[PDB]
Design a protein around this ligand. Structure first.
Ligand SMILES: CNC(=O)c1cccc2cc[nH]c12
Ligand SMILES: CNC(=O)c1cccc2cc[nH]c12
Ligand SMILES: CNC(=O)c1cccc2cc[nH]c12
Lengths: 178, 245
């Protein structure tokens, strides 16, 4: 097996920690959802190729501009996350997260991931967002942002139901192998 | 880690660690508070373990088996003895607070009601100054350590055999040299996340809510000072590239 490294980036409320936890355990924890994620090395076989994929979170490093880049050396694939229940997290993608990743990870494929897709048809979410003249992120809005920033691709998932989670990490592995 | 502490922190949560008859005696809010305190101690036990792999398995093994040029092992593992001293002491304090809280006749049933004071002590005074000085040095030497590792692995056959040998066991799967260095650098930014969630469930006692609020403030001040004190060292960097930073 070949070793590859994945780093997930995005705002504090984007769901990146939950996404790594659910994938690494293959389950949404029923008793306790951990606050933090240390690291993990997933055994993944995609399109006949065996890879050891090391997983890293940047949660907690958002306000520390000199500590945060230390997570980037030798990254093979970036997952750039936003939350579908937060159009504000999508807005910070092109002029905050994107130039940073392009500087420290030149030529590394970026996959733009819309997390919490289960909240797109949640009445409580739609009511809270309507108070700030907002609505859940539309699938075309996610695709257009991914197109704009030069992302390798656009994907959606729900850590809560696990839908789309395996497909995100299998595609990230394929991107890391190119 | 030692077997006694590994077994005490084997369960996925505090609610699964204690006996069910003991869990049933507490309110939901106390269980939520204890689950996060348990996660803080469990991750501190693993962080000390990462430091022992670095000092004992890698560093000492290279000194005792390989013929590396002087100053090469220090370059691969900067400040590891100092970091091990800070965290082993902090872990000792957390584990003694848990031990004093155990019910008589039990080695697993406890409730920690007063964490805030311990966190204020760790993140203030000389221990905070030592943590700030050590992480500012470690994090400024992080990129150099990774590049030195990659150079040695690519060009030294005996170094490559040593690494492949000691990292072959499945219990070392997440703990190769580069993975340990990033695990240590990332440890300090996990503290505010853990402290904020403990604070969310510690409103029942006003003195505890105030103590955790003070501790959260101190950890953030330490992180800001460390972040402002970092500048990556690079082997063979010329003075002109440094003063034109
Ligand atoms: C170009 N030098 C830089 O240091 C840099 C550039 C872009 C984003 C970030 C975030 C931290 N540093 C950054
Ligand atoms: C500043 N650039 C853009 O806004 C952009 C670029 C590429 C595709 C789309 C779709 C919508 N906007 C796009
Ligand atoms: C970091 N501060 C927090 O309050 C927090 C963190 C992670 C999960 C939950 C669930 C409730 N609060 C949480």
């Amino acid at each position: 097996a070949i070793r590859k490294k994945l780093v997930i980036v995005g705002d504090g409320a984007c769901g990146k920690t939950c996404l790594l936890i659910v994938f690494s355990k293959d389950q949404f924890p029923e008793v306790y959802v951990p606050t933090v994620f240390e690291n993990y090395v997933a055994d993944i076989e995609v399109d006949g190729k065996q890879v050891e994929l090391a997983l890293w979170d940047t949660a907690g490093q958002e306000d520390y501009d000199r500590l945060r880049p230390l997570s980037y050396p030798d990254t093979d694939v970036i997952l750039m996350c936003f939350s579908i229940d937060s159009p504000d997290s999508l807005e910070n993608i092109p002029e905050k997260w994107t130039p940073e990743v392009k500087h420290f990870c030149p030529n590394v494929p970026i996959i733009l991931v819309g997390n919490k897709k289960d909240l797109r048809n949640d009445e409580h979410t739609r009511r809270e967002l309507a108070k700030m003249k907002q609505e859940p992120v539309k699938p075309e809005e996610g695709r257009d942002m991914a197109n704009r920033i030069g992302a390798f691709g656009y994907m959606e998932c729900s850590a809560k139901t696990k839908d789309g989670v395996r497909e995100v990490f299998e595609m990230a592995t394929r991107a890391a192998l190119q | 880690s030692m077997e006694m502490d590994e077994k005490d922190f084997a369960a996925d949560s505090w609610s699964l660690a204690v006996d069910s008859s003991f869990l049933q005696q507490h309110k939901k809010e106390v269980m939520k508070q204890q689950d996060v305190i348990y996660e803080l101690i469990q991750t501190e036990l693993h962080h000390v373990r990462t430091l022992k792999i670095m000092t004992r398995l890698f560093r000492t093994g290279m000194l005792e088996e390989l013929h590396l040029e002087p100053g090469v092992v220090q370059g691969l593992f900067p400040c590891v003895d100092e970091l091990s001293d800070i965290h082993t002491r902090f872990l000792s304090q957390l584990l003694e607070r848990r031990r004093q809280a155990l019910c008589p006749g039990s080695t697993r049933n406890f409730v920690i009601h007063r964490l805030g004071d311990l966190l204020i002590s760790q993140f203030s005074g000389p221990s905070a100054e030592q943590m700030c000085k050590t992480y500012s040095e470690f994090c400024s030497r992080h990129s150099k350590a990774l590049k030195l590792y990659k150079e040695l692995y690519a060009r030294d056959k005996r170094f490559q055999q040593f690494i492949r040998k000691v990292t072959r066991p499945a219990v070392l799967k997440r703990h190769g040299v580069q993975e340990c260095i990033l695990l240590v650098t990332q440890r300090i930014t996990k503290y505010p996340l853990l402290i904020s969630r403990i604070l969310q469930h510690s409103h029942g006692i006003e003195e505890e809510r105030q103590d955790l609020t003070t501790a959260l403030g101190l950890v953030k001040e330490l992180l800001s000072n460390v972040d402002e004190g970092i500048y990556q060292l690079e082997k063979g960097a010329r003075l002109q590239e440094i003063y034109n930073r």
